[PDB]
Symmetry: C3
């Protein structure tokens, strides 16, 4: 079982959600975060700007999915978010040891 | 070691917190998120509403605990949050490879 | 690969950030959270914290953990916790680079 975590530009949330819905994902969690990547949050070109570091608003998307679906989920997020521009995002896949649907007690692959 | 991550209805935070403190947890992190589950955020019953997707406010509760204690934590959260209604929550358990208490430098299960 | 997650005092964010970027880290995610530890929010209550998340390779995560530990410490209760999780796969969206190349 996999937790696919993606950090994307906020305006891309709808398209990413749409892309995942098409795959039949059974749930999604999103949160507000800030971050930088290898350009260190630089959006200006004043002298010395590359020595600065800034945090930029992002959205973190988390989707719990089965092993036989996670690769397609990763690809869908890539395809939805990629516009060929810096900051378009990064995806991290983590493993889920156990899952439980609170209302029903269903577990693991049933619970995703 | 295990990170227990529960996504619950916001109004249940206090009852879940109290259940866990009574159980004896020694730490807890909470954050605001939005999300949907297998009902796609549907809270209305008008004709066609079943084709829509919405994000609902939730709270994410995270508790790092030892292997021999995580099942008790999961069940305590389930008992506190379960009211037999959709959206009552989802619990994901991830493995923690290492832990450190920053003040003291204590590690592993001693840091939790 | 590892996801190093640290819950720190909000005023320590700049030093933790600088410790990491000076070390050579080239990405960082931060979130607003609340929490309590062994002292139950007492000098039960929730207190504001920052969650820092850094994805790093196996050969650098120990340096990263140590850098955060030193940077976030003050010797006072509430200094925080570092939890290290494993990352199975990573992708840089723009380039399609994967795993350690993506971080
Ligand atoms: N190593 C990392 N650890 C934690 N979060 C990261 C890491 N790298 C990136 N992030 C998060 O992902 C967001 C998007 O990163 P971004 O797309 O800028 O990656 P990048 O490596 O700089 O690639 P690009 O050159 O395409 O910009 C960042 O703002 C940050 O929130
Ligand atoms: N597969 C998933 N991936 C990521 N987050 C999820 C997933 N399933 C649920 N969540 C998160 O958990 C919250 C609560 O989910 P919820 O209790 O509705 O689960 P469910 O599977 O729909 O069960 P129920 O039928 O009891 O509603 C969601 O709003 C979302 O934030
Ligand atoms: N076991 C835990 N699970 C989840 N979050 C935790 C845990 N322990 C601590 N945290 C988070 O880390 C923050 C800081 O914890 P804190 O430094 O107070 O830990 P502590 O064990 O009480 O150590 P100290 O005695 O140095 O205060 C908490 O407010 C909470 O957000
Ligand atoms: O995130 C952006 O929008 C541009 C800045 C960037 O790519 C970075 O900080 O790595
Ligand atoms: O989250 C709710 O309160 C109801 C909606 C729901 O259960 C879902 O989207 O899965
Ligand atoms: O978080 C603080 O700043 C002090 C309270 C504390 O250490 C705790 O709740 O464990
Ligand atoms: Mg970038
Ligand atoms: Mg539901
Ligand atoms: Mg404490
Ligand atoms: Mg593992």
């Amino acid at each position: 079982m996999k937790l696919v975590m993606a950090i994307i530009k906020p305006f891309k949330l709808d398209e990413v959600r749409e892309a995942l819905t098409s795959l039949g994902i059974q749930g999604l969690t999103v949160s507000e975060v800030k971050g930088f990547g290898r350009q260190k949050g630089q959006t200006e070109i004043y002298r010395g700007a590359e020595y600065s570091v800034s945090f930029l608003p992002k959205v973190k998307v988390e989707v719990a999915v089965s092993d036989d679906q996670y690769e397609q989920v990763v690809e869908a997020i890539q395809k939805a978010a990629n516009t060929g521009r810096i900051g378009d995002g990064k995806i991290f896949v983590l493993d889920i040891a156990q899952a439980v649907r609170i209302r029903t007690g269903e577990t693991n692959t049933e619970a995703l």
